[PDB]
Design a protein around this ligand. Structure first.
Ligand SMILES: *CCC(=O)Nc1cc(NC(=O)NC2CCN(Cc3ccc(-c4nc5cc[nH]c(=O)c5cc4-c4ccccc4)cc3)CC2)ccc1Cl
Length: 386
């Protein structure tokens, strides 16, 4: 029953490098809107490219005949910007997309929290670290503009959702066991066993998002990993889409963790998260990023072309895992097949690991953060500078 509604060439604005790119897009009746570098000859649909519950806007800036697909995915507002040659083509696309979207459609207040610290600013709102006065718990509050608009042990849970007169607010649970980059920086390098533990929990969470939620996390990096009070991994959802910063070109964020297919603004899928897994687990066991340099052109080339290299102190099992995870071609990448996470869970690096015990947190955390409870503020104090 799934068929193509409309297909053709489009100019898509790059998601990390702001240049316009010629891409062949396929609009299907299941809601997927995917672009390709070349017209594909050609299973579960990813919600990352869904046009369901989205609003279309027609703009003449910064380029005439531009249309934008603005979507609210979970707790993050995203924008996909496209360009055509003639206004007639734009109307054809916007009508087709809207038609598909139509066919698919077939108390807690702000005074209850205390402002603590600005976590991040985005185009359509901000993220704030708050503390509930009643319980003393820590939370990350996503405060999004109103007019522009599920539990896993290793994912930051959405606690509350409320709105003001002009703002929509999402309340994330905030781990108090400390940032993982802080822990890795302090201890320089994690052992293979400890990295196996963190890695296993990450795999479990990614497996959940892929099979149950049918979504790609795409932001898997060290900065988005935290530990709770018990030392278990928490993958964070504190992000917001920003506008890039002007090396005369304009870039949005740092590219060191981005998958090659994501950098080239090509078709991407579940394999992206496995690349991220490779980057994270590489840094944990090697003590540094897989690809690093100052020039963005250089950094791109290292990610796109340069083969990953390993220290002599790294074991063959770890080398096999990282080599598979950091394959530049997602079709050849470990976990890039139809088996997805099972391809990684069955890898010999995770031999002996009982994955049911992983999800149920039966595995003893090798590291216990110096906190007494979920309200302990040690990783919020001056020590964080040390
Ligand atoms: C700076 C340049 C730039 O922004 N370019 C750019 C990017 C994009 N696209 C995006 O920004 N996409 C974002 C990628 C990261 N992704 C993170 C994410 C957070 C949360 C979830 C998530 N989703 C669901 C959905 C349904 N049910 C669920 O239970 C969940 C749970 C979670 C989740 C919760 C907690 C922890 C982890 C996951 C998925 C992904 C957000 C989108 C567009 C344009 C441009 Cl220019």
């Amino acid at each position: 029953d799934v068929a193509i509604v409309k297909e053709g060439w489009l100019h898509k604005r790059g998601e990390y490098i702001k240049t316009w790119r010629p891409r062949y897009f396929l609009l299907k009746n299941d809601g997927t809107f995917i672009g390709y570098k070349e017209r594909p000859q050609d299973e579960a649909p990813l919600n990352n490219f869904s046009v369901a519950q989205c609003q279309l806007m027609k703009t003449e800036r910064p380029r005439p005949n531009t249309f934008i697909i603005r979507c609210l995915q979970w707790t993050t507002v995203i924008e996909r910007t496209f360009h055509v040659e003639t206004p007639e083509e734009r109307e054809e696309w916007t009508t087709a997309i809207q038609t598909v979207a139509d066919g698919l459609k077939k108390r807690v207040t702000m005074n209850e929290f205390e402002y603590l610290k600005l976590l991040g600013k985005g185009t359509f709102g901000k993220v704030i670290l708050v503390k509930e006065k009643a319980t003393g718990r820590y939370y990350a509050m996503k405060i999004l503009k109103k007019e522009v608009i599920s539990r896993h042990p290793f994912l930051t849970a959405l606690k509350y959702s409320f709105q003001t007169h002009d703002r929509l607010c999402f309340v994330m649970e905030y781990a108090n066991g400390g940032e993982l980059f802080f822990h890795l920086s302090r201890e320089r390098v994690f052992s293979e066993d400890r990295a196996r533990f963190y890695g296993a929990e990450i795999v479990s969470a990614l497996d959940y998002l892929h099979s149950e939620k049918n979504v790609v996390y795409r932001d898997l990096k060290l900065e988005n990993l935290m530990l709770d009070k018990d030392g278990h991994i928490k993958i964070t959802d504190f992000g917001l889409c920003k506008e890039g910063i002007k090396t005369m070109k304009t870039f949005c964020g740092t590219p060191e963790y981005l998958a090659p297919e994501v950098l080239e603004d090509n078709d991407y899928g579940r394999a992206v998260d496995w690349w991220g897994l490779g980057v994270v687990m590489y840094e944990m066991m090697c003590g540094r990023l897989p690809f690093y340099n100052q020039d963005h052109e250089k950094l791109f080339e290292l990610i796109l072309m340069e083969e990953i290299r390993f220290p002599r102190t790294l074991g063959p099992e770890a080398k096999s895992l990282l080599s598979g995870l950091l394959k530049k071609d997602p079709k050849q990448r470990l976990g890039g097949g139809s088996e997805d996470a099972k391809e990684i869970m069955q890898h010999r690096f995770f031999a002996g690991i009982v994955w049911q015990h992983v999800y149920e947190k039966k595995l003893s955390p090798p590291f216990k953060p110096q906190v007494t409870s979920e309200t302990d503020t040690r990783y919020f104090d001056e020590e964080f500078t040390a």
